[PDB]
Amino acid sequence: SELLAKFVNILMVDGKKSTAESIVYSALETLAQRSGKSELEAFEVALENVRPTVEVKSRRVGGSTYQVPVEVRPVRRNALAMRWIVEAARKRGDKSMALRLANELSDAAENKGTAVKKREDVHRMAEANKAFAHYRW
Amino acid sequence: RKQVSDGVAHIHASFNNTIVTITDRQGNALGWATAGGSGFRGSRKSTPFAAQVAAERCADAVKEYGIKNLEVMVKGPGPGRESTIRALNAAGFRITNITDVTPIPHNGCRPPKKRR
RNA sequence: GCGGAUUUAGCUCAGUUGGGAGAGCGCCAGACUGAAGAUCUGGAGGUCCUGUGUUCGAUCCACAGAAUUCGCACCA
């Protein structure tokens, strides 16, 4: 899978991919030991839940800058999902590296936390300005 | 609960905010709706979207009355005018005819400050 | 003196299936914005007048007391 090959790169600091893949596969191992599910399936679902659909941009239309909702492209949703998962993992308080990734991939499936707060905040900014919906773009 | 079945759909379109007022063949308004009635404050009410919601709701409220067909009568220009129309074309009613009964005066009225 | 009403988190108040203590505002923080504002979200904040009694358990019943308010009564 190319998704896993891409996720191991963002965890590659200073070019240590050999050690990077060591923590990744060690996370999927403990992930199946903690949860009765295939490591692969539990992985994909974790990235799917962390993706926005409509992003609001600022634009000067005559007098002031209006916030106009716009659709996001499928190429950026994969990057953000990957990036926000590793950053949230480095936020946990468990010394074990492989454990921080295993738990994060699990909580990401359960849904709840800061990453979710930002998802709701953006979802709220949207629809709140439904009066500017006719500007689908 | 007078089951009008058929009536008229007045569309007061304006640059401030469109307002729909469904009525019967006589002219007695059975129910009305507006962007303000939809919850919109006052600046967002003028949007054509706030006109669609006001048109559909004003219609649905009439659906209860039992009306099926209506005659739309557009008045005054402004955003949401055509939006309110198509909004009516849909819903649960059958737009039988559309007419632009926009007054557009003749000669004897002193225009407001904005117009002068 | 007498009767009526009232006595919940700082403030203003909801809360009777007796078995969740809650809302608005305010305060703090977050989000947002250059930022401040407003809005949105989150948290903290309660001897729910006091004692006793009644029940398995009472803010939500009974009794007693206190305070506030009001009418009345008194006033060489």
UniProtKB/Swiss-Prot annotation, chain A:
Q: Which UniProt keywords apply?
A: Ribonucleoprotein, Ribosomal protein, RNA-binding, rRNA-binding, tRNA-binding
Listed name of the protein: Small ribosomal subunit protein uS7
Function, as annotated? One of the primary rRNA binding proteins, it binds directly to 16S rRNA where it nucleates assembly of the head domain of the 30S subunit. Is located at the subunit interface close to the decoding center, where it has been shown to contact mRNA. Has been shown to contact tRNA in both the P and E sites; it probably blocks exit of the E site tRNA.
Q: Which GO terms describe its cellular component?
A: cytoplasm; cytosol; cytosolic small ribosomal subunit; membrane; ribosome
Annotated source species: Escherichia coli (strain K12)
What stretch of the complete protein does the chain hold? 20 to 156 of 179
The family classification in the record reads: Belongs to the universal ribosomal protein uS7 family.
Say which domain of life the source belongs to: Bacteria
Q: What is the effect of changing residue 97 to G?
A: Significantly decreases affinity for its own mRNA
BP term (GO), one: negative regulation of translation
Q: In the UniProt entry for this protein, what further remark is given in the free-text comments?
A: The strain K12 sequence is shown. Has been predicted to contact the N-terminal domain of IF-3 based on footprint studies; exactly how IF-3 interacts with the 30S subunit is controversial.
Q: Which GO terms describe its molecular function?
A: mRNA binding; rRNA binding; structural constituent of ribosome; tRNA binding
Q: How does it assemble?
A: Part of the 30S ribosomal subunit. Contacts proteins S9 and S11. Cross-links to IF3 and the P and E site tRNAs.
UniProtKB/Swiss-Prot annotation, chain B:
Gene coding for it: rpsK
In this UniProt entry, which cysteines form S-S bonds?
A: none
Source taxon at top rank: Bacteria
Give the record's keywords alphabetically.
Answer: Methylation, Ribonucleoprotein, Ribosomal protein, RNA-binding, rRNA-binding
Similarity comment text for this entry: Belongs to the universal ribosomal protein uS11 family.
The cross-references to SUPFAM superfamilies, in alphabetical order and at most eight, read: Translational machinery components
| Its biological purpose | Located on the platform of the 30S subunit, it bridges several disparate RNA helices of the 16S rRNA. Forms part of the Shine-Dalgarno cleft in the 70S ribosome.
Protein name as it appears in the record: Small ribosomal subunit protein uS11
Say if the entry is tagged with keyword Zinc.
no
Q: Does the keyword rRNA-binding apply?
A: yes
Q: Which GO terms describe its cellular component?
A: cytoplasm; cytosol; cytosolic small ribosomal subunit
GO terms for biological process, alphabetical: cytoplasmic translation; translation
**Signal sequence range:** none
The Swiss-Prot or TrEMBL record annotates one GO molecular function as: structural constituent of ribosome
Note the HAMAP family from the entry. Ribosomal_uS11
PROSITE patterns per UniProt: RIBOSOMAL_S11
UniProt cross-references to InterPro entries, sorted A to Z: Ribosomal_uS11, Ribosomal_uS11_bac-type, Ribosomal_uS11_CS, Ribosomal_uS11_sf
Q: Kindly give any further remark recorded in the entry.
A: Has been predicted to contact the N-terminal domain of IF-3 based on footprint studies; exactly how IF-3 interacts with the 30S subunit is controversial.
Relate the assembly described in the record.
Answer: Part of the 30S ribosomal subunit. Interacts with proteins uS7 and bS18. Cross-links to IF-3. In stalled ribosomes contacts ribosome rescue factor SmrB.
